[PDB]
Each structure stands twice: as C-alpha cells, then as structure tokens.
Amino acid sequence: GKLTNGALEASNVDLSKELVNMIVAQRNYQSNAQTIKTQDQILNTLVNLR
Amino acid sequence: GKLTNGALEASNVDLSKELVNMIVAQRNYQSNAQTIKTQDQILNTLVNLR
Amino acid sequence: YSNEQEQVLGQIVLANFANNEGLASQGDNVWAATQASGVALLGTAGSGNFGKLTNGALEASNVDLSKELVNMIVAQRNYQSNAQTIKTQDQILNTLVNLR
Amino acid sequence: LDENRNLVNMQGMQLTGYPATGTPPTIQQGANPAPITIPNTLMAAKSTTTA
Amino acid sequence: LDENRNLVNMQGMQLTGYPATGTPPTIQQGANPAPITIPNTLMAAKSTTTA
Amino acid sequence: GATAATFSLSFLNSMQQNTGANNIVATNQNGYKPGDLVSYQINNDGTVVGN
Amino acid sequence: SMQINLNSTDPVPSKTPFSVSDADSYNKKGTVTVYDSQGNAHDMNVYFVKTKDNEWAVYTHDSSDPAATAPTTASTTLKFNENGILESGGTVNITTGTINGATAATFSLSFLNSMQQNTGANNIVATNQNGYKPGDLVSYQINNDGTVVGN
Amino acid sequence: SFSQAVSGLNAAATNLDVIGNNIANSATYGFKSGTASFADMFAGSKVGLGVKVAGITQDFTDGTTTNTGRGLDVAISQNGFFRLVDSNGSVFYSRNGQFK
Amino acid sequence: SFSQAVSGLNAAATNLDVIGNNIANSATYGFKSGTASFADMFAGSKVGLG
Amino acid sequence: VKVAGITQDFTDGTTTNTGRGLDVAISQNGFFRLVDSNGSVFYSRNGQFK
C-alpha cells in the first residue's frame, strides 16, 4: 500500500499490559521462590532425618 | 436530500459529555488501580505468609 | 411513507419470569432461562407488570462506589484475619514438628 | 436495521415481537412472536372503495 | 416468591405464618401456621351490598 | 343481560347546614371489579399486603 | 388446556357472517401450537364470538394447513352463569390436519378454570399441551434428592 | 480475579484512547461520532469471568456546517455519500465535497 | 480447623472476585447487581464444621 | 494407603482477548483436531495457527 511520505513509525508499545505482565510474572517468580523454599526446607528435614 | 451548496460540515463534537467521560473513565481507572493495589498487597501478604 | 402514510411494521413483545434470579448469562447481558427461573409470562408494555420504556435512552449500570470499596476493605481485612490465623496454625504445626 | 431487514444488535441478534398482517396490516394478538422487519418494499396500490 | 407461589429462600424453604380466609379475607388468630402465598389469581368480583 | 341488583343505601351522619351550599360529603360502596395482583409489600407487622 | 379471562362488558360482534379474516366478526382469537406423530406444528386459531350474555361460540381452525376451509360450525359454546363462573362448553376433542402426509390428530381440549372478568379485556391466561418434538440429551444435573435429572 | 482486573484496565485504557482520538479530531470537517461498546463473559458454572469490549460503535448524527468562501466545497446534508476512486479503481466514499 | 480456614479463605477470595467483577462492569449498559451468599455446615454431634 | 492415579479436571478457565484473529480458544465442549507427520489424530483447544 501507499506508505508514510515524510513520516516515521515509532514503536507499537503499550504501557498497561507490559506492567501487568511485569507484575504477574513477578508473582509467579515469587511462587517459584516460595516453592523452592519449601523444597529446601523439606530437604533440610531430610538431612535432619539423619 | 438537497446538499449544502458552498458550505462544509465540521465535526459533530460536543465538549461537555466528552469531558464527563474523561472524568468518569479516569475515576474507573483509579478504581482499577486501587483494586490491583489491594490485590498486590494481598499477594505481598501471601509471600509474607511464608 | 412518502405518500403521507403510516403503517405499523411490528410491535416488540415483553415477558417476566417467576424468579428473576433464575437467569443464566450467555456471555454479555443475554439471559437464557432455567427451570428455576419460571415460565414465559408474556405481555405488552404499559399493561400490568410491564410499563412504558425509555424511548431513545439506554440504562447504564446500577453500580454504587462507596459500598463496593467498603466491601473491598472489609473482605480484605477478613482475608488478613484468615492469613494471620493460618500463620498461627503453621507456627503451631512448626512447634509440633519441634516437639520431636 | 441490518441487510436481512431486521433490527439487530452488535451481536447480530434480531429482536422479536408481534407482527402485523393484512391490508392494511394491524398488530394481531394471537400471533407467534416474529422478528420485526422494516421493509423498503413498495406499498399496496389501493384504489378508492369507501369515501 | 417462587414458582410454587411461596416466599422461599436460597435453600428453597418456605416461610410460614398465619393465613387469611374469607371474602374479604382477614388474618384469623386460630389457624394452623401456613406458608404465606402471593397469588396472582383474579380477585373476587363483589357487587355492591351496603353503600 | 346483567341482573338487577338491590343494595342497602344509608345516608348516615348526613348533616343539615344552617347556611351554606348543598354539598355531598362522601360516597362509599363495597362493590368493585377485579382487579389483579400488581405488586406486594409488607408493613412493620409482618403482614404481606397485596397491591 | 387453555385458560382465558374474558371481559363481560363486550357487545355482540356486528359483522355477519363469520370469517376467519374478519376480526370484527369475533371478539377474541386464540392460537395453540400442537404437534402430531410427524411433529408438524399445527397452530389452531381459536375464535370466540359472543352470541349473547355469557354464551360464546368457540371455533377451531387449523391455520397451519392451508387446505382447510373456513370453519362455520361451532367446535363448542362456552356458556356461563351470572357470576361468570366456568359452567359449560369448555371441553371438546378437536381433529387437526395433515401436513406433508401426516395424520390428522384428534386431541382433548379443556378450557378449565377459564374465568369471565366482570370488566377488563379479553386475555388468554395460559396455554398448555403435552405434545412436543425431540429433543436430545444436552446436559445433566442432580438435585438435593439424588435424582439424576436430564436436560 | 486478575483477569477481570486487566480486562477492565485495558477496556478503560482503550475507551480513553477512543475518547482522546475523538477529541483529536474536534472541529475537523466531515467528522461523525464514534464510541466504544462493552461486553461480558459467559458463566463457568454460574459465575461469569471477565468484562470486555464489543467494539467500535460509530454514530452518524447530523453535525455543524459552516458557510465557506468557495463553491467547490459542498457538504452532504441528508443521507448520502460521495463516490471517490483511487489510482487502482477501488470505490470509496466521503461526504467531503472540497474538490479542485 | 484447617477445613474452616480454607473454607473462609476461598470464600473471601471468591467474594472478592465477585466484587472485582462487579467493579469490572461498572458503567456498562444493562447491568444488574450480583453479590455472593454465605452458608454454614451441619453439626457433627453439636459442633459444626465449616 | 496408595494413589488411585491422576485425575484431570476440565472446568472452564480464564480467556484473554488477543491481538491476532488467528488464535481462537474453545469456549464450550469441543476440541481441535490436529495431525502429525505420521497422520495420527490429536486434539487441542489452542487455536493459534499461522
């Protein structure tokens, strides 16, 4: 099609959904961190089993 | 029908209801922001649960 | 009509049910009835249970702001009470582990 | 008013109601609820009978 | 108000109470407690007796 | 094709003004026509009142 | 079953004789959609003409079958008392038509508890038939009684 | 929960973008109003999860017309649209009548 | 004990989801209010659990 | 005391509006029919296809 004569196209970046993903993946990372914390406490008790 | 001979039709933009929607959707956005703030504080306590 | 004529092209019907709460959402504001909803109480506007509608006007939400935020605060505090309760429970079970 | 002569919403669902039949058509009370149409068809060329 | 003409809760239990009988019906003090109904039935076509 | 109905008619407490104008105070009859359930309310006594 | 509330203050229809296309020849027209063994939806136009006080000639017309002529005979005649209580003329067996090689189905039709309003407007209260068409298992639920209920 | 939150957030953001674009073409010639619609979501069992946008809803009410100096700028008063053609012969429409 | 805890926790979470969905369709056209109800549990001997 | 096995649950989930039109999730009961290089039939509710 006909282009943008004398005009330049910037990014297609939206702000809101990016920060939403930044919050949600952070909380998923926190879930992973607490999960591995519980795993390491379980293995600590497995050490404390002996 | 008979058109506007030698006359050009501008926008049908009203001012008052546009600014009303600008206020109301802003306040709805503030409600969403405080809602997600409370959500993130809840998930902060869920992190602080462990 | 162009020849100074007026002919009715139809008339929209209306209905009520035995239970308004017995509806079922079908995506948007679209309601499929249930067995607990009631049979189609048919009729026309302005007669009996039906009244004159809003000609050229659209009804928005019935949302109040204050009581919604009040419930948002109160259920959050109840959630905090549940969280501290389960915190005390887990500390009790931690001591039960530390019992041995 | 859609291309299929009916008043449809953004979801395309046609609103129903009482139809009118006859010449001239009037809303009858004992009909099935029908999707209300706005036809652009030509009117009935009726001659003078009672004046 | 459910389909069985009674004021029922979310559990469907009907609330009971004193019924009214007669024409015109009044609440009597010596009845069994009855589930209170809101009937959509037609009223009694009463002619003029005392004016 | 109705029936010729005979009713009792009382002019109780109809007073004679010493001066003034002949004026009907009030009229009342116990005869009416149905009449159907439109809505319903309950007062502060637990009585379900039909409208 | 067809229950209908009818105004008593209505006059006799002056348009003579009766025609199915003459709305002024009657006062009220009903319509009930029934189904046969071939499952065709026969829509009975039920016309009611006030002959005199409390007496109404009730005509049935299978409008879904175009080969049926204009009914000039009475299917029944609803006759009532002074108070407007349902007295007589409220039950008739009506034979339907044949659509696409179906069978003409005869059904019992009751006008039970059809009341006569002292004043108002002629209004059908309710219609009901035990005839339907399948119909298949969409879903299933169980209430608080252990009964598996089919949807 | 967070799905309804991001749904309402993006709906409010997109509606405000629609409103700001309607403000951006204030007092331009040949403009018809356009707004946004709303949508909801289907019930899971009987719950309902999400509130969405049904799409852009253009409105075609009559606007304001100014007398101009030329005679070759003719707006359309009633229902009607000017037929335009591109270099590739495709048919388009515009109520704007400014042509030289 | 923990049954009542998870019952109250999921009830508070589901009620807050109901409230947030009611906020999500603020100012939409054709909206009627919807809330959540509560329930309790039958007594074991005379206790009540949940 | 043992394990009877894996119990999959098929309740309705959360759906997000996406930018493309070629990513169509399945709302009601239904499954997309896929095929491998060996012609075997598989199923997936995911509708992201290019």
Author numbering:
A (entry chain G), B (entry chain A): 353 to 402
C (entry chain F): 303 to 402
D (entry chain F), E (entry chain K): 101 to 151
F (entry chain K): 252 to 302
G (entry chain f): 152 to 302
H (entry chain A): 1 to 100
I (entry chain F): 1 to 50
J (entry chain a): 51 to 100
Authors' description from the paper:
The axial structure consists of three morphologically distinct regions, the rod, the hook, and the filament from the proximal to the distal end, with a few minor components. The function of the hook is a universal joint that transmits motor torque to the filament in any orientation relative to the motor axis. The rod is a drive shaft that penetrates the peptidoglycan (PG) layer and the outer membrane and connects the hook with the rotor of the motor. The distal rod and hook show distinct mechanical properties, although they share the same helical symmetry and repeat distance and are composed of similar subunit proteins (FlgG and FlgE) with 39% sequence identity.
The previous cryoEM map of the St-hook also showed an unassigned elongated density between the D1 domain and the D0 helices. The shape and position of the density is very similar to the density corresponding to the l-stretch of the Cj-hook or that of the St-rod. The D0 helices and the l-stretch of Cj-FlgE were well fitted into the EM density with slight modification. The amino acid sequence alignment indicates that the l-stretch of St-FlgE is 18 residues shorter than that of Cj-FlgE. Consistent with this, the density of St-FlgE corresponding to the l-stretch is shorter than the other two and terminates at the position expected from the sequence. Thus, we built the model of the Dc region based on the Cj-FlgE structure and constructed a full-length St-hook model. The subunit interaction mediated by the l-stretch is not as extensive as in the distal rod. The l-stretch extends to the −5 direction and interacts with the inner surface of the D1 domains of the FlgE subunits in the −5 and −11 positions but not with the subunits in −10 and −16 positions. In contrast, the l-stretch of FlgE is shorter than that of FlgG and only interacts with the inner surface of the −5 and −10 subunits. These interactions probably reinforce the hook structure while allowing the axial compression and extension of each hook protofilament for the bending flexibility of the hook.
